[PDB]
Design a protein around this ligand. Structure first.
Ligand SMILES: CC(C)S[C@@H]1O[C@H](CO)[C@H](O)[C@H](O)[C@H]1O
Ligand SMILES: CC(C)S[C@@H]1O[C@H](CO)[C@H](O)[C@H](O)[C@H]1O
Ligand SMILES: CC(C)S[C@@H]1O[C@H](CO)[C@H](O)[C@H](O)[C@H]1O
Ligand SMILES: [Mg+2]
Ligand SMILES: [Mg+2]
Ligand SMILES: [Mg+2]
Ligand SMILES: [Mg+2]
Ligand SMILES: [Mg+2]
Ligand code: NA
Ligand code: NA
Ligand code: NA
Ligand code: NA
Ligand code: NA
Ligand code: NA
Lengths: 1011, 211, 170
């Protein structure tokens, strides 16, 4: 029958979907949510055998184990075990597009298990098996007898084994197909893997059982009253003695309870549901659930006899909250939300797409610690535990159906085809039936990148009908179709319109006011954090805060989808697309996270944390104004610390407890600060600290900060006169200057300072020369490939213009001996094919104090693409342990991504000045620096800089960070100016005009001396 | 859906047609047990979508119907919207679940009386004049079935038409129905006679209600 | 598989639905709505045999005419021919309510037809068969080979027979 090549067959003999069950036989265990003896885990060691096609599977396998097969752990993806390669492709399907057909060579995974089953389980009741996740399709056998079939890799598939099991030992046979008609609906931008990657378990339910239950919570106008309504469905013989009791608990205190016999109210001419009953419990002054305060109650559903004999009990955590869109605003418990979200895939560098509690918790903690309050399940229902954690820790969730047909042409070719409605419907309906009772889920999503088809409209309405408590959204076909309650574009820019035909991405500010538009706007994806990115992140948040209907968005995305591989020496390294012989592939586009695969933060995470802060500040005179952006909670665990420093030197500090009501304001009067005698800029830094640990953070956690420049006293004092005069020595090839134990050498043929000596020890390995380029960032590259070049990408424009090929040509180089110094004047011109790209004019003044003042004035041809940077670079001979600087830090920061950084005196080990992006590029820059110290050298001025053991050339030529090798000495790049990094997206130029180096003429000066 | 030639004749002779999906689950309890079940959405979708794909070019068809007597289920709402999306040129109607649900553009009750209310629980049949003005109601009303012509009947037919002519929003209806479903049988003498339910040994049966 | 007791399978190998087609090869004939040589009616005398259940159908039937079958006119309802009784019930289902199962005793009508096809149709183009109405479900075989399955008694079910037809009789 080849059911895996027929969208008309998504399953065979599979049971109906439902909320999480455990079939407790003791109400107390159900209340406390302790393990259930009726729910067994079949996780562990299974038998596995890989085949090139299902037709290669031996029929003997159905009856007994294959001696060839190995013993592997389940859940798992077999690519992670080495049976075949994981494939990384973005849009293009990993198989030829010819629905519903798949490759004849269809990698087949044969899983089997021999396990025990107690007689008690077969004596009475129903015994079912549950596969939480099988990628992407599978047939099931139990003791040689065929059981069923199932598709949709991201939702549980259940089958009744009651008639197949025997008391004692039993054997399960699972044939998993890598490709199936379901694959056409699973084209998400991620690693394509396969296997039994989620839990497998056995569930025993009584014959008379609770087959389904839904919990709803309605409120009065001010949420001071609520009614919990629970609909319960049963299977088995109907009996007048049957009863259902729904009790609600807050801790060990029962707050409400309702009991009733089965028999719902009349719904139509034929009566009502005799097998259903709805319980309604009144709850006065309910404790409301939100990401701010995840208050939860426990609902226990007891199926029992009138006399009180318990048949079975199910339960769930209940969060009292109302989600609704009113007057164009998305409201939670009556208040307009501001979504500080992020998209999160289920990815592990070692286990692939197999999730574990430890990693889930790690992510949630990091997310909340970085001010995120929402997560989008990009782009499929997650492991069941995820929702439980979000319910308890407090995170708003967008539950999304496992449907993405990005690779089709047009994108909606399948979604607008009624032949595919059935398959699509199940991916939506079964998700809702499974997760509808989780309070963390506040919005349903119809899928991702599948254009807009009639099937979406039908399913949009289906959800609106079955569950009106949650808005429904979908970005496909333009982000504002008839299938979405929220304008949810991906990568729409703040002020810039992108008028694409049919599916334009309007500036978000402009989108809200288009004729007839009234919906709220929340980006489903924005700020593509690929590599050195997140430039312009602050622009989004300023807009979010100013526009009521701009209610946030979800950053793309949480964690790099890099996988671990090992070199000949057994050392692990991070791999991306194509590193497994997988082709075609999309290389590094699988890495777009705020954190590395091992959860170590990328520099961009701190910029996200700062912009997503819940406290806003304003300074006026001696008064600091604190405004709370919390909607429900008071600042009951916050202490404000303030510090005033003069060029890094602390002068005063203090702390004041924050006492701000949600949406409220608090004024803090700073004590008079004594004007310092010394010259310099006074800086005020404030930070919010959480004195008490929480469920998600440690005591002392910093949740927000802000800086302001206070009084500045410019230096007017003249430096002591020196009793020495540098001596100039001239030769045909050099201009040398001597002063004490210091010497400077300028090559007259190159026109650059080629060497500097301190006590006759060389300080340079490479001369000090101008640099106008940078090892391209992923944002500079875009989608441009060696074969398919994108002439519009910044890197291609720089290349075509000859910026990387351009060679300096000396125009002038003179030396003049002055009264108390030696003056070197130079001029260079960078040309490509007869075109003058840049002109650099400098003067080097070395005085009697040993200081060398460098003045640089550069001209950039108005018609050449704006350069990546305008500065100098050289390879210092020395390798020092620490880097000390007065400027923005301590983390890496760029022109359009420096709001999180603070001006102060920072000191870090040299290694921290290098950001290990899996795909190497310009990195580790620090801006707004007035002083830099490295070894015996000191540079002063107003510049940007990065310093490491890697040259821009090496970074530019190396595709993987593990292949980088420290070069001799230290490479220093000191920039007068540096271009923004961009990031609104990573496939088209995204650096805003204000961050491009288009001034034509630039000026900067530096003073180099010995500490 | 009818034999293809029927639409051709209606196009050429001139008759407004309500094309109806082959979906009726009258015997279920409650009536919407299957139509509110997502497991049955696929089967139902084909009966609606394939009808539209076949007859969408016939001018005689002016209204689409989601079926008959299957209560009101979520599947109806999903399919109502599917049609609205693929073919906005024709209103969509459905009587199940109260005749004025979210799955119908037209209040299309069956056997609702002119002046007399029939306050059935959950699915009342209001007087048609009263139905039009219920708080918030603005839709037109066209009975999908009225004046059950069983045997010596149609008493009070004039009452409907007087109301139809007086009230703008009462735009008529469809009498039930056109022709007796009697079948021919022959006696011992070979003489033909009209037979109804039960005359073929069929049991249980509903006798003369087929006429 | 018992596809007739599974609402998840409403058809197998059935072609997409569409508006009335006649595949004219002349614009003027299309304009006047005159007959099309590319659209043939198979209505007429067929071979029919009644069975109390699908399991009672002899496998030989797929390969050759059953000597016990009768020659009847199609289209038709076999109850009108007297093979079994028509049932009149209003609301109550004519079968036990137990979705998606139906009575084990399922009256089965085995129809068959031997026909010839134009030569040119076997060398080029696509030849499909169209059943405008089959109550209530059915399996299709052509020259002994299984073709498809279809449901919904009131809409046409179409299947491609291009790969099944042969020169001579089919
Ligand atoms: C490659 C772009 C044209 S499509 C773009 O690619 C990104 C890669 O991370 C993400 O998958 C986005 O969601 C997708 O729209
Ligand atoms: C610093 C807070 C956001 S942590 C927050 O405080 C709340 C009370 O205000 C509740 O205790 C929440 O459970 C807790 O996570
Ligand atoms: C049995 C009735 C209460 S239901 C009533 O029966 C009639 C019989 O002609 C028609 O079928 C109507 O449409 C139906 O609603
Ligand atoms: Mg299939
Ligand atoms: Mg995609
Ligand atoms: Mg009150
Ligand atoms: Mg700032
Ligand atoms: Mg079927
Ligand atoms: Na806003
Ligand atoms: Na990606
Ligand atoms: Na506090
Ligand atoms: Na590189
Ligand atoms: Na009227
Ligand atoms: Na009748």
């Amino acid at each position: 029958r080849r059911d895996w090549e027929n969208p008309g067959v998504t399953q065979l003999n599979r049971l109906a979907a439902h909320p999480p069950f455990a079939s407790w036989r003791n109400s107390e265990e159900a209340r406390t949510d302790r393990p259930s003896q009726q729910l067994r885990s079949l996780n562990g060691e299974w038998r596995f055998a890989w085949f090139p096609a299902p037709e290669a599977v031996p029929e003997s396998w159905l009856e007994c184990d294959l001696p060839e097969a190995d013993t592997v752990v389940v859940p798992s993806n077999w690519q992670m075990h080495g049976y075949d390669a994981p494939i990384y492709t973005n849009v293009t399907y990993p198989i030829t597009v010819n629905p519903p057909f798949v490759p004849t060579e269809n990698p087949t995974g044969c899983y089997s298990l021999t396990f025990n089953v107690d007689e008690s389980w077969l004596q009475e009741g129903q015994t079912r098996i549950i596969f939480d996740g099988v990628n992407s399709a599978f047939h099931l056998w139990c003791n040689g007898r065929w059981v069923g079939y199932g598709q949709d890799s991201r939702l549980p598939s259940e089958f009744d084994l009651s008639a197949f099991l025997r008391a004692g030992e039993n054997r399960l046979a699972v044939m998993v197909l890598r490709w199936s008609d379901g694959s056409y609906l699973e084209d998400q931008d991620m690693w394509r893997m396969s296997g039994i990657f989620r839990d497998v378990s056995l569930l025993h339910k009584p014959t008379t059982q609770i087959s389904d239950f839904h919990v709803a919570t309605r409120f009065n106008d001010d949420f001071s009253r609520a009614v919990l309504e629970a609909e319960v469905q049963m299977c088995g013989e109907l009996r007048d003695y049957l009863r259902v009791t729904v009790s609600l608990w807050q801790g060990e205190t029962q707050v409400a309870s309702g009991t009733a016999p089965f028999g719902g109210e009349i719904i139509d001419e034929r009566g009502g549901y005799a097998d259903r009953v709805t319980l309604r419990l009144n709850v006065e002054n309910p404790k409301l659930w939100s990401a701010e305060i995840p208050n939860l109650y426990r609902a226990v559903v007891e199926l029992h006899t009138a006399d009180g004999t318990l048949i079975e009990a199910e339960a769930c955590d209940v969060g009292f909250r109302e989600v609704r869109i009113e007057n164009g605003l998305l409201l939670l418990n009556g208040k307009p939300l501001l979504i500080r979200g992020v998209n999160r895939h289920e990815h592990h560098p070692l286990h692939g797409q197999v999730m574990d509690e430890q990693t889930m918790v790690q992510d949630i903690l990091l997310m909340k610690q970085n001010n995120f309050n929402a997560v989008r399940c990009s782009h499929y229902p997650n492991h069941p535990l995820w929702y439980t954690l979000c319910d308890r820790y407090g995170l708003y969730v967008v539950d999304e159906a496992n449907i993405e047909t990005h690779g089709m042409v047009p994108m909606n070719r399948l979604t607008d085809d009624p032949r595919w409605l059935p398959a699509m419907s199940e991916r939506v309906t079964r998700m809702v039936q499974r997760d509808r009772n989780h309070p963390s889920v506040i919005i349903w999503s119809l899928g991702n990148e599948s254009g807009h088809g009639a099937n979406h409209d039908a399913l949009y309405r289906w959800i609106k009908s079955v569950d009106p408590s949650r808005p429904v959204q979908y970005e496909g076909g333009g982000a504002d179709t008839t299938a979405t309650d929220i304008i949810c574009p991906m990568y729409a820019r703040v002020d810039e319109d992108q008028p694409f035909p049919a599916v334009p991405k309007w500036s978000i500010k402009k989108w809200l006011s288009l004729p007839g538009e009234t919906r709220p706007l929340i980006l489903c994806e924005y700020a593509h954090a690929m590599g050195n990115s997140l430039g312009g992140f602050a622009k989004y948040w300023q807009a979010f805060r100013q526009y009521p209907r701009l209610q946030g968005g979800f950053v793309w995305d949480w964690v790099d989808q890099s996988l671990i591989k090992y070199d000949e020496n057994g050392n692990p390294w991070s791999a991306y697309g194509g590193d497994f012989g997988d082709t075609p592939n999309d290389a590094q586009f699988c890495m777009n996270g705020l954190v590395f695969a091992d959860r170590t933060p990328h520099p961009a995470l701190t910029e996200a944390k700062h912009q997503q802060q819940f406290f806003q500040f304003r300074l006026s005179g001696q008064t600091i104004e604190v405004t709370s952006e919390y909607l429900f909670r008071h600042s009951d665990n916050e202490l404000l610390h303030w510090m005033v420093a003069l060029d890094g030197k602390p002068l005063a500090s203090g702390e004041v407890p924050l006492d701000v009501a949600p949406q409220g304001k608090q004024l803090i009067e700073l004590p008079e600060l004594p004007q310092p005698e010394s010259a310099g800029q006074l800086w005020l830094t404030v930070r919010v600290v959480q004195p008490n640990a929480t469920a998600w953070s440690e005591a002392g956690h910093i949740s927000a900060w802000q800086q302001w420049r206070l009084a500045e006293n410019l230096s007017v004092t003249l430096p002591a006169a020196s009793h020495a005069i540098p001596h100039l020595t001239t030769s045909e090839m050099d201009f040398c200057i001597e002063l004490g134990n210091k010497r400077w050498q300028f090559n007259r043929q190159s026109g650059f300072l080629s060497q500097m000596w301190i006590g006759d020890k060389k300080q340079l390995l490479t001369p000090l020369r101008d640099q106008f380029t940078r090892a391209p960032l992923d944002n500079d590259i875009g989608v441009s490939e060696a074969t398919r070049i994108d002439p519009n990408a910044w890197v291609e424009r720089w290349k075509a213009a000859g910026h990387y090929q351009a060679e300096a040509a000396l125009l002038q180089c003179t030396a003049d001996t002055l009264a108390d110094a030696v003056l070197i004047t130079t001029a260079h011109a960078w040309q490509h094919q007869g075109k003058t790209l840049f002109i650099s004019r400098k003067t080097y003044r070395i005085d009697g104090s040993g200081q060398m003042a460098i003045t640089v004035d550069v001209e950039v041809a108005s018609d050449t693409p704006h350069p990546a940077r305008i500065g100098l670079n050289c390879q210092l001979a020395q390798v020092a342990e620490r880097v000390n600087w007065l400027g923005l830090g301590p983390q890496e920061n760029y022109p359009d991504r420096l709001t999180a950084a603070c001006f102060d005196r920072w000191d870090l080990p040299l290694s921290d000045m290098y950001t290990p992006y899996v795909f190497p590029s310009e990195n580790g820059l620090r801006c707004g620096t007035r002083e830099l110290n490295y070894g015996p050298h000191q540079w002063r001025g107003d510049f940007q800089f990065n310093i490491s053991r890697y040259s821009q050339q090496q970074l530019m030529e190396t595709s993987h960070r593990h292949l980088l090798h420290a070069e001799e000495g230290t490479w220093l790049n000191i920039d007068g100016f540096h271009m923004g990094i961009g990031g609104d997206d990573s496939w088209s130029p995204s650096v805003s005009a204000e961050f491009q180096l288009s001034a034509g003429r630039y000026h900067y000066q530096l003073v180099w001396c010995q500490k």
